[PDB]
Amino acid sequence: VGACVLCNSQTSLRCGACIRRPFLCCKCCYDHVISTSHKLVLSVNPYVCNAPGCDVTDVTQLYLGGMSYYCKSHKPPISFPLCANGQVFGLYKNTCVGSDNVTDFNAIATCDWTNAGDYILANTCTERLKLFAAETLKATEETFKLSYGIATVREVLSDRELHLSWEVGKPRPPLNRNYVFTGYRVTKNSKVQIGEYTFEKGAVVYRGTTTYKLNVGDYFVLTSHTVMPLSAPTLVPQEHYVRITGLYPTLNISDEFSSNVANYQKVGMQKYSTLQGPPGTGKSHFAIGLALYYPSARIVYTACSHAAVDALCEKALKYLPIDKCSRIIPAVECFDKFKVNSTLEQYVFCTVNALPETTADIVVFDEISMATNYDLSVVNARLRAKHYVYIGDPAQLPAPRTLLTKGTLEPEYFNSVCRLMKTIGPDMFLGTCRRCPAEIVDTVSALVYDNKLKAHKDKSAQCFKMFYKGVITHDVSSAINRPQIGVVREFLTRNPAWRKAVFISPYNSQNAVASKILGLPTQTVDSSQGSEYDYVIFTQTTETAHSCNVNRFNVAITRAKVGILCIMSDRDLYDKLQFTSLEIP
Numbered sequence: 001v002g003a004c005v006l007c008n009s010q011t012s013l014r015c016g017a018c019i020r021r022p023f024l025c026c027k028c029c030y031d032h033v034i035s036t037s038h039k040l041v042l043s044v045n046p047y048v049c050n051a052p053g054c055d056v057t058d059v060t061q062l063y064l065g066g067m068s069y070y071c072k073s074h075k076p077p078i079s080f081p082l083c084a085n086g087q088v089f090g091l092y093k094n095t096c097v098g099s100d101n102v103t104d105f106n107a108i109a110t111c112d113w114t115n116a117g118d119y120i121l122a123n124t125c126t127e128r129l130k131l132f133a134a135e136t137l138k139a140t141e142e143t144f145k146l147s148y149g150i151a152t153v154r155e156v157l158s159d160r161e162l163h164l165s166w167e168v169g170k171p172r173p174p175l176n177r178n179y180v181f182t183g184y185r186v187t188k189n190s191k192v193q194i195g196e197y198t199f200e201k202g203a204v205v206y207r208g209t210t211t212y213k214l215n216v217g218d219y220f221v222l223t224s225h226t227v228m229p230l231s232a233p234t235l236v237p238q239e240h241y242v243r244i245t246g247l248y249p250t251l252n253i254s255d256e257f258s259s260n261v262a263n264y265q266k267v268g269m270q271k272y273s274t275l276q277g278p279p280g281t282g283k284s285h286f287a288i289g290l291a292l293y294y295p296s297a298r299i300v301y302t303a304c305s306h307a308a309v310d311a312l313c314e315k316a317l318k319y320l321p322i323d324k325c326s327r328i329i330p331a332v333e334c335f336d337k338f339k340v341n342s343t344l345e346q347y348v349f350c351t352v353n354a355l356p357e358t359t360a361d362i363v364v365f366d367e368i369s370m371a372t373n374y375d376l377s378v379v380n381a382r383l384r385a386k387h388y389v390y391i392g393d394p395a396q397l398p399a400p401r402t403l404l405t406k407g408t409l410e411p412e413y414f415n416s417v418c419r420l421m422k423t424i425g426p427d428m429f430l431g432t433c434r435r436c437p438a439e440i441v442d443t444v445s446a447l448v449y450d451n452k453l454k455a456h457k458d459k460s461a462q463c464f465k466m467f468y469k470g471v472i473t474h475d476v477s478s479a480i481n482r483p484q485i486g487v488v489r490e491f492l493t494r495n496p497a498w499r500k501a502v503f504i505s506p507y508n509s510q511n512a513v514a515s516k517i518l519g520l521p522t523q524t525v526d527s528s529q530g531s532e533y534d535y536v537i538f539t540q541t542t543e544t545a546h547s548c549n550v551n552r553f554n555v556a557i558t559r560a561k562v563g564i565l566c567i568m569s570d571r572d573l574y575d576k577l578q579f580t581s582l583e584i585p
């Protein structure tokens, strides 16, 4: 027994064909079975024909006959159909409202999550369907990982380099950092974990969590997990206050945080607030400074990734009493300078998926573009806070959507928080970029920030762009543009100072070729998010939707503190770069 996801109506039915088995009320369960292919229904029992060796599961072809369920062929003389009178038969038949359109719930329940429109719907439907969609999508995502063939160590060629043998009659996953494997040792009667791993084309290059002397027979699967059901909304109800509530501001603050004092007061004057921090504007500075502005306030600092939490820890370590901090870790190497797993500590740093059930004066949720509605609900379920602060940038990269192929996902659809920031705007905006030369700040200000992002630094005169299509080659799941790497090689010979530069591209295969030919450190745009480097060399590689994505392009060029070279494929983004154009040698 549970709650209809459409009505909330109390009910004893769950759709058995829906992978999450939502509870549906007699009405909603009917409207759902008669208007989709979903025909298996679960109660306290499953509406299936309890006749010996009959295969009838369709609820519309079954009858209660006694206290058992039968099809037409096997039913007793005295029976009533399970599925008639615009209603499906179960407990609480007299408390049931329904809905005018079940259309959104069917779409969410049936879609394969390959189309953008599926994520658009999942983020614009009612709040209870946002939770159903977020569970359905995440279960569809964790199941898809099982579709992928086992990789097995056939030969250990070197250290850091392997020969894999793949399971037959199943696809092989892409070999980039968005697909993290787990190794396993061949035992007496079972297997035991042996750290997590990633792979890249050679033979294959492997950069595993821990070191080992792994040998033939060791194999790898993308580790999936149980998706738990959601209960809490993606956002609590907003409340605006006329005074700061449940927070006591400091009388003496330092001029390091004095630029945020007005924003800190705003945080205390509503239930949740959104902070848009463009690249190098001071998001973590903001977050730690909030502690010093409300010194008595218990603050839980959270984010999706261990890296995002550890970077809050690194900033705390520099401003907060260490004795007053704790890093929560579940039973991967992260921050090890606080007492571990001290929930009652005044400053708690913890990933979403590891959060304890606790209360706080303020919850700070960082790198919000990377959050899903699933993460948003989990935070609200674990943390009851006087105030919630969501810090991020909807102009930066979202969580990868491994099933999406048809369509692009616009920032207003990344999650509920990003939707607010792109429709009503953010509560707070960090308007000064301290990282990047003015040429890069002017470019991204016009590209994605409605000309509101201002440069601290002057022009560097070291921001350059080349329009060169080159030649595009494709491997199993990535792109290469050798001529664009050639152009960079010629550029380095004439400009040898740029040999301390970081190589960035949209493709891991472009990066592997560049690493060998140039010897620069490489990062995918996606892996560079949150990092900064003095000099950046960027090859667009292709003009695809992936390489032309404005959020990706915005992250790519805002990695640079001093100088950047962009080898561009797309005439559009080339023309938008406020960089010195260079001829082709």
Ligand SMILES: C[C@H](Oc1ccc(C#N)cc1)C(N)=O
Pocket: 462, 497, 498, 499, 500, 501, 535, 563
């Ligand atoms: C003025 C210019 O400075 C650079 C210094 C470092 C890099 C890199 N990478 C590029 C350029 C020079 N050294 O010619």
Ligand SMILES: [Zn+2]
Pocket: 015, 016, 017, 018, 019, 032, 038, 109
């Ligand atoms: Zn269903």
Ligand SMILES: [Zn+2]
Pocket: 004, 005, 006, 007, 008, 009, 024, 025, 026, 027, 028, 029, 097, 098
């Ligand atoms: Zn219902």
Ligand SMILES: [Zn+2]
Pocket: 049, 051, 054, 055, 056, 070, 071, 072, 073, 074
């Ligand atoms: Zn039967």
